[PDB]
Amino acid sequence: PLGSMSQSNRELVVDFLSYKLSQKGYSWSQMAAVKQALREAGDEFELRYRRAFSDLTSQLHITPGTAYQSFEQVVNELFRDGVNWGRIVAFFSFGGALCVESVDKEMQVLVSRIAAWMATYLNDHLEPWIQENGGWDTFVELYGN
Ligand X SMILES: Cc1ccc(CN(C(=O)N[C@@H](CSCc2ccccc2)C(=O)O)C(=O)c2ccc(-c3ccccc3)cc2)cc1
Amino acid letter at 133?
N
Does the footprint of ligand X cover residue 118 (CB under 6 A)?
no
Q: Which stretch binds ligand X (CB under 6 A): 3-11, 12-20, 75-83, 119-127?
A: 75-83
Q: Name the nearest CA neighbour of 64 among 96, 36, 106, 118.
A: 106
- Confirm if 28 and 68 have CB atoms less than 8 A apart: no
* Cα–Cα distance list, 145 to 31, 37, 42, 140, 142 (Å): 18, 11, 16, 8, 5
Considering only 33, 38, 62, 78, the residue that binds ligand X (CB under 6 A) is: 78
Q: Which stretch binds a second copy (CB under 8 A): 11-19, 47-55, 56-64, 71-79?
A: 11-19
Least distance from a second copy to the Cβ atom of residue 127, Å: 7
Report phi then psi at 28, rounded to 5: -65, -40
Does the footprint of a second copy cover residue 17 (CB under 8 A)?
yes
Residue 130 neighbours by CB under 8 Å, 6+ apart: 88, 122, 136, 139
* Cα–Cα distance list, 128 to 70, 80, 125, 135 (Å): 22, 16, 7, 9
Considering only 54, 59, 123, 138, the residue that binds a second copy (CB under 8 A) is: 123
Does the footprint of a second copy cover residue 132 (CB under 8 A)?
no
- Residues contributing to the site for ligand X (CB under 6 A): 41, 44-45, 48-49, 52-53, 55-56, 59, 77-78, 81, 84-87, 89-90, 139, 142-143
- Residues contributing to the site for a second copy (CB under 8 A): 4-5, 7-17, 19-21, 24, 26, 28-31, 34-35, 38-39, 42, 92-93, 95-97, 99-100, 103-104, 111, 114-115, 118-119, 122-123, 127, 136
